[PDB]
Amino acid sequence: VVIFHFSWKMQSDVWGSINDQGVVTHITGGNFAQSSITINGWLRDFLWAQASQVIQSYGSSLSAYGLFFLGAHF
């Protein structure tokens, strides 16, 4: 729970890309302040949303991470 909290909060309110005006687009547009308050938000906005990267890893150089995902489930 601690590392999930850290990862979501960082990808939602700190990390992201800055631009020319100083407009900061975060990895997730502050979706932690409104979606993390119910368990459906954790299952949908965190796991289901963030989980897509690893599922599509196959066929690229991050394929080993997909393989380890499935093997660890096993």
Partner 1 sequence: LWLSGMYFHGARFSNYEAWLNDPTHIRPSAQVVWPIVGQEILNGDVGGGFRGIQITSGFFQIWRASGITSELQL
Partner 2 sequence: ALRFPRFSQGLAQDPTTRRIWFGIATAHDFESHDDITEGRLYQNIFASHFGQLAIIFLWTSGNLFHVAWQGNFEAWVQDPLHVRPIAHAIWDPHFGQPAVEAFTRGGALGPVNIAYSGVYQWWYTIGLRTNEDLYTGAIFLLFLSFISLLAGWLHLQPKWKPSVSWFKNAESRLNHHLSGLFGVSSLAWAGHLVHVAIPGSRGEYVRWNNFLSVLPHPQGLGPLFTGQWNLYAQNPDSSNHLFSTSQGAGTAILTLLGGFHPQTQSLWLTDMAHHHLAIAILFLIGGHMYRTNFGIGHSIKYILEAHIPPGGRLGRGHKGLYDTINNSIHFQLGLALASLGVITSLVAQHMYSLPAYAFIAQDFTTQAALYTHHQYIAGFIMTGAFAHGAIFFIRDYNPEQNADNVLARMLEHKEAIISHLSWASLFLGFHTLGLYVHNDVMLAFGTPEKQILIEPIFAQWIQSAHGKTSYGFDVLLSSTNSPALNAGRSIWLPGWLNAINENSNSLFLTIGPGDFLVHHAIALGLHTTTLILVKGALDARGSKLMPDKKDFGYSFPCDGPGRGGTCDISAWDAFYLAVFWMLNTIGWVTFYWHWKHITLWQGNVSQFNESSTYLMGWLRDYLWLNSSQLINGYNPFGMNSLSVWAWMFLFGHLVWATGFMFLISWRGYWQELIETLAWAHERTPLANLIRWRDKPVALSIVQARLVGLVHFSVGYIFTYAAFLIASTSGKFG
Contacts with partner 2 by CB under 8 A lie at 34-35, 39-41, 43-44, 48, 51-52, 55-56, 58-60, 63-64, 66-67, 70
In the complex, the smallest distance separating the C-beta of residue 28 from partner 1, rounded to whole angstroms, is 21
In the complex, the smallest distance separating the C-beta of residue 20 from partner 1, rounded to whole angstroms, is 17
Q: Which is nearer to partner 1, 40 or 61 (by Cβ)?
A: 61
Task: Please answer whether residues 11 and 28 qualify as being in contact, where contact means their C-beta atoms are separated by less than 8 angstroms.
Answer: yes
Q: 47 by DSSP, 3-state: which?
A: helix
Question: Torsions phi, psi of 25, nearest 5?
Answer: -95, 115
Q: Which is nearer to partner 1, 33 or 64 (by Cβ)?
A: 64
Question: Torsions phi, psi of 26, nearest 5?
Answer: -80, 170
